[PDB]
Amino acid sequence: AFLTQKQKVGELKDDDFEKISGVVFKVSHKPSGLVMARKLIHLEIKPAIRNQIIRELQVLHECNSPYIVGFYGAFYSDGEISICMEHMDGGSLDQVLKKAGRIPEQILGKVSIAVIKGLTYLREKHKIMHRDVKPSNILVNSRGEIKLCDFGVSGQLIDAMANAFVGTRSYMSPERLQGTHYSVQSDIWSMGLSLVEMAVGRYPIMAIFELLDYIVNEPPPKLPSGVFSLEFQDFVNKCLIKNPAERADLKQLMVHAFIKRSDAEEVDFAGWLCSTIG
Amino acid sequence: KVGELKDDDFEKISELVVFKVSHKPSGLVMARKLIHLEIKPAIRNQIIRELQVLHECNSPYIVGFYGAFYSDGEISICMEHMDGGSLDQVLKKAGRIPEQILGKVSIAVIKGLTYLREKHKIMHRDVKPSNILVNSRGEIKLCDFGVSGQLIDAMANAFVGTRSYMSPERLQGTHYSVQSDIWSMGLSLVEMAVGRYPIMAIFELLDYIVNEPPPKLPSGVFSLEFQDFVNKCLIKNPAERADLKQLMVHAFIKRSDAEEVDFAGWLCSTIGLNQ
Amino acid sequence: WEIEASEVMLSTRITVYKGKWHGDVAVKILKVVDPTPEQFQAFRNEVAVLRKTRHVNILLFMGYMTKDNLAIVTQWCEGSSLYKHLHVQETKFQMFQLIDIARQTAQGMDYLHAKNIIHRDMKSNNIFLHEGLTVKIGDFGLATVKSQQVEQPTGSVLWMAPEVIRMQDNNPFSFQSDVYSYGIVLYELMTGELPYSHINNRDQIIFMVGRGYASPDLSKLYKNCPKAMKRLVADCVKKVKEERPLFPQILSSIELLQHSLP
Amino acid sequence: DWEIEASEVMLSTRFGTVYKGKWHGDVAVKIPTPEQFQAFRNEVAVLRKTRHVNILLFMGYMTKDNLAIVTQWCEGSSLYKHLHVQETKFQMFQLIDIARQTAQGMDYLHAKNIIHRDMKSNNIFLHEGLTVKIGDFGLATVKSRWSGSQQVEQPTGSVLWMAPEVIRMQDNNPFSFQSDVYSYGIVLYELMTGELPYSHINNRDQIIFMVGRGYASPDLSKLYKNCPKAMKRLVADCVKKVKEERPLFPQILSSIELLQHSLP
């Protein structure tokens, strides 16, 4: 039903938008009355680089799924790159993590189900990897769908963004940190780190080089066995294997028992978020 | 005997800006005066060409000239060294100047002006006692005169010149002649006669020159014909000022020429030198 | 150095504003609605360093602002940054004036070290090529006089030193960190491309430099260059801080290689 | 900024011709009696305040041994050489740019309450022939509420650029903004004509009496017919014999920017 909403919105121009509330801002189109999310990216790069980036950015039109954030368009204005997407009113899960402190386990199960289905969809249709799986890049609405966003779709834009924000927290797999072969197992590592981070609310153990050193030379932290059932620790220790050879692939995440029993549970996310806000 | 002149041929001895020098192949002592000019090159070439004019300027009352050249951005003028110094230095050392020496220097400057009139048709324009020199042998020569108008135009910027002995009629741009030099000679003779300006910014001195008459010397200190001489030299009217032929028949010049004065001996006693 | 608000008119915006005050001036205004006192002491340190700098190769400080939002008044540079000349527009520079740029900015950093100033943020965006011939060094917001725990680094990771990255010392910032940053500026200056261009991961670059495995590649230096220049380039990028040469020897080497042209 | 240098500078030979030194690049050096000390501390006091792109950049001072002032070494020649020695064929846009740069430097100096008192084209240097540099602040001063109490000394410079009220010296302090305005007007004359004022006069005392009595002014008919009319009006009314009628420097900058933007 969301497809026809883009159909009644034609050309998008910077003068037709207004300030409401890189950097991310919300925008609205006044006769339509819909809400759009604008991402602003600053780059000091060549004109030909900007045009091949925008030529790689059009691909997001055919990226259509209930597990992927919808897309409107992208253009150039005032020496800046503008990315227009459809707005999640619930925000990313990082902000509601700061709001609530901890998240009930079935909600993490539903998030895990959504992200693994999104990874399967992305690897089947475009054969590309996400590269940036962290709780700031995953979004929820007031309705209940959980979608991925800001994935590595444009290699030239990745080269442009390769040097910018400093990095306070890092969720990136070791095997790409040595510079070796990386695959979807990197995104699986990042997903496991994200879920344990929202499980306990803080990193359970410094400058960024110290985190890099701790990640490369030491095994990741593990949950106590006396608190939660052993199946969830089995989930996270299959997701936190250092060597990607025996680290679990998406097929035995699909036939894993915890994902099945979380799918069997009926968790109404919209009702709990409405109880959260009021 | 002196041929061409170059900067490396001169050896600095003393300062009199003026540096006392000598020419090493010849061995004679000269006086070298340096002036700084920021002037176009071809103009300085013309300055050299009509500073060659002083080759024909020879007289017992005009400072002898040897050569001129340009080096290191400085115009170099060379003249005969003449050791007794100017009347300003003699005035500072001796305090007063007696009247017979005043007659002798008046005769010297008037004969020099007549020589310049009759042989070169040019004028001095800068009569002041710093520009008249005295020799140990008693001769009184003249120098530092306006031989080439481009050099006046080039030097017409910097003068220091806290005072001015300039004629009144040359302050508003009227006709000028040797009468202005006669008037400045009158101021110089009065200046040394008493040893001071006997009466303070420079514009006030020009105001003082232009608008009210010059002072008089007292009659009790000098002979009456001396005051007659100066008051004929200090007439404001350019036409009423006596010209050179009038001063050469005045009573003071014939009594001064009739006087026999040991001027050389008195100046050597003043400077205290034994050759 | 007090300037009241009503004389400075904020004409155009290119954060930074092109204003008019007794001439064209560049105004660095910090538009913060809630000024914390940390930004206050940072501003005081910045202006205290800027008052001690008076050199032709340093961007000239003129005044500051106190009320409304904090602002810094400096002269308006005409032209573009060396980053914009080198990686955005690609002006075809010739060899001579590149070594002229090198010796001029080396003179600037030598004067800063003589006046006991650590720039701490030496990179390509801080190099203004003013009318194409004169270099200016600016943005001394992180400048510090030597005389405590150092603040967290915030600049780009390319120009940092390995002992800056691993930060095992309380104050790893010194002369030699600026020397290595100048060496990286020389590296991009003689080649025209950013170092480690084959790596497109920020954390990978940070870790590979911090463990000392990665190094700049001198293979893209043309072989028609004199061997003294490539020896200098190899010497200024040396990892260990105690054998990196100081700026007077760098200037001596540059003038020695400049003198030999017939 | 302040503080003393050391023997890092070199002495080559123990009004000359060159006093150039070397102290982190090319620098310019200037040169125990009390009269030198008064002017020397006045120079350092006025030079600590000057930070502008049109003003010569003071670098440091030396008090030990001989008195020295170190500043940046400009590349090029003085403006006087550019007009009266080599006769460079300047175009009109360059001359108007020179005029507006000098006006902007004066506006900065007078807004920061500084009188150099001593304009001429000798003190204006063309840095690579593009950017003006105003220097030689030996006779600079700072105005104050007690500046009228002290009696000013003789300028003893060149009479072609001084004001009639300066050369008369009837007031205790004849110097003001408008004296510098008149000197800048003579500078405008030299830019727009190319020769020294009162060329038909070859006597300095003639100039002193003929100008100090208000009987002389530079000939405005020597301006070129293709000069801007507002430029002629500006150079005409900034050389007025009345002290009060001379416009201030903000008016001069406004007129110059108006005539620059007026040209198609």
Ligand SMILES: CNS(=O)(=O)Nc1nccc(Cc2c(C)c3ccc(Oc4ncccc4F)cc3oc2=O)c1F
């Ligand atoms: C740490 N790993 S890394 O070193 O590989 N760095 C990188 N990682 C991952 C990605 C990139 C670049 C990236 C960025 C950041 C990006 C952001 C927004 C975007 O819009 C939308 N996206 C999805 C849905 C709707 C949208 F509107 C497209 C984007 O596309 C991109 O390509 C990296 F540089």
Ligand SMILES: CNS(=O)(=O)Nc1nccc(Cc2c(C)c3ccc(Oc4ncccc4F)cc3oc2=O)c1F
């Ligand atoms: C202030 N009054 S003013 O305004 O009229 N200016 C001027 N007045 C008068 C003259 C000039 C120029 C001048 C000067 C000063 C001059 C000086 C020395 C000189 O050497 C010898 N002289 C005589 C004998 C032997 C020499 F080696 C020749 C000179 O020749 C000159 O032409 C002026 F500029």
